[model samples]
Target: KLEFMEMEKEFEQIDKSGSWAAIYQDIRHEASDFPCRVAKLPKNKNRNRYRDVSPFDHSRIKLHQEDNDYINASLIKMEEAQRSYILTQGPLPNTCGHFWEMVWEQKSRGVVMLNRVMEKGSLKCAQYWPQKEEKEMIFEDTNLKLTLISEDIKSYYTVRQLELENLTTQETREILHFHYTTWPDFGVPESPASFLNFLFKVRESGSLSPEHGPVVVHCSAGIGRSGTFCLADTCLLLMDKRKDPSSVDIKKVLLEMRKFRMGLIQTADQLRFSYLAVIEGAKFIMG
Candidate 1:
């Protein structure tokens, strides 16, 4: 059977098997207990957005410019799928400079922001980029400045073109900023169609290519929504290349991804949504 065919069958099986809870729990159990010593250090403790969420030291992205090279982020590399993403939390006000420094140092071409600056009256993320009025924002700590060039706003998402400059060297680069505005915390998009439309828009931009650095992906905690985006993209990319799409095991791939970052796909509902998105996305790819 073709992988897409199996994906279809598996989709039905998982949906109707009355075992969504069991399956989600199993994955959570498997992904539990990874070490994140750097994030726990007294010096690095305040840098994390959530007291419970931390990046594993082994795959965590280390900052070079800062004396303390700790940031609440991990580099998720899916070599077989030819995809790499910098999974990170929404930057704290103090660590916003470090966030940009990581982006500049990694040579990442784009930043995929999944959460809003404010969510439900709470500050989910710092206003890390320059807004329309300001036009530019500087990070004195890293000697880098970001200037807004243009913005395209849609019903659910906003795409912005930002110019990143090294204040010291006077070098500049264009970085695409993808902000999915309507996605709620710990929840899926309204529909797979809308999410896939946004996903394909990102693919068309060529920001996720091998030539550029890893795409920087983050939400509030940088795990749930961020993880969903990476997992669906990774699975779909793998399926796009394979003759047998069925071999692309969603659970297995996610478990492998969890080794690099903790607490991916936070809720059972999120896990179900990943399957829905993948199935819906497979139709577009296979056709």
Candidate 2:
């Protein structure tokens, strides 16, 4: 109860801290100037998850040694936590093969999908993973095969274990796909408690560990909810190690993370939710 009270107090403090909105505005403003070489690329832009979203060249994912590159993906690195994440827009129907190609090349073992296939009567993301009814799905463009080994359904999320085979070498690896069913349409969760519960579930799979490839995190645009997840997880890990929660500067940490990918924490609301989750997560570490 004490922890919850302090967390609410801190949440209001940050919201009232005149400086928070400034940070968000500056980040949003800078996002416009980010290079959208999407036009220059031979790849079709219509296939992008969002017309307005594109990856910055410096941090964009490079496939086939830069001879070809996708427009809407960025690699985010957190040095303090030894965590790397590939933040990208949700897959487009035409780009699903490219999506799997990224997974194969990056050696990603887990995909953190934070949106549903449809939301608010609109398409939120493409169903790139194998459908539940199907035993296997193959992407001929990327020459990769995905077989659904098993699936575990929870109230808020679903976890599917997939065996990914690289047709080129006939080599296979396991990838875990975590789809958070209720997001975007519902805004933030009812509380940070359920949010933290979902996050720890992702960590327990060992997919977010540095030893594996960077975890792929995406929503519709990949900037809103995706950034929130990464921010909360990284801040909690830092607070656990540092012991002084005050020393963990959330705004400064977010600024540093934005250096890798543009416009993290899309709205002031999303920004606030990130802090709330961080504070709630600190309680467990504090105990």
Candidate 3:
């Protein structure tokens, strides 16, 4: 087991703002148990005897990679469609240049985009201009829907909102809010329970619809938290399908998602953690 002292020493050396060299050094030194090796090339003809075989099968691994790639591409396509819908419904004023400026314009028309951020020290970026505007504009627009959820651990925050431009002309003007959260604060244990609560609210909101558009989620760089959320949602859906054959097939769902996006839950740990969280959630629910 990793001792607290060892973990602290490792975290201390990690210059979260430094370049890749500093990042790699901290990872290598702190997570020493992680499987990474450096050695001279083998010179013996009997090298095969000394090779360490991975528990994962090569063919199965390749198949899994292909499957994941397909799903990622599909997600990108869906996101693009949502963006197109927003653009079509609320055309930019032609003066906006920066991406966030366009996003701000969209907010004026009741369309909002979420952006997640990590802890204060690990915040590598120099500016968070969009968040400032979000705070100011949220309450201004009568049709606007804005919600920000900060992680309990000072590590991250999740912003969720609804895109209201595509609503039917005759439909009543009702606000639909989404919820998102980041996880694994520097020293805190992983808490998918909190994340699940956010997700449950979204599922229960009765706002998500195919015609409306897929929910938008993104982390500081749109990888870590976004990926985890997608993975967790996919796994939970799959479990539910197993219990009821009439339910949607998550494998097919993910496969359809990757046609446009490049990565969805790119890391192995994200995928594994999603599975673990589902198991834990099930146990808690049963109890």
lDDT of 1: 0.89
> Could you say which candidate leads in TM-score?
1
TM-score against truth, every candidate: 0.96, 0.89, 0.42
Error of 2 at 153 (Å): 1.3
lDDT of 1 by residue, 138-206 (tens): 999989999998899999899999999999899999999999998899878878888899888888999
lDDT of 3 by residue, 14-115 (tens): 324333344333323332121212211332122111133111111111112221210100122334112211111111122112222223332322222223
- Candidate 1 has its poorest 10 consecutive residues by lDDT at 1-10
Predictions in order: lDDT: 0.89, 0.79, 0.33
Scored by lDDT, the top model is 1
TM-score of 2: 0.89
Candidate 3 lDDT score at position 101: 29
Error of 3 at 277 (Å): 2.6
Which of candidates 2 and 3 reaches a greater TM-score? 2
Between candidates 2 and 3, the lDDT winner: 2
lDDT of 2 by residue, 1-287 (tens): 34446555767776778556676676566543456575345555575766666677778887653455664789988888678899998888877888888988998999998888888788877778777645888898789998888788887888899899999999999999988877764277657887888898899999987788899999988888898889998898887777465577777788888887777777777777788788877778767
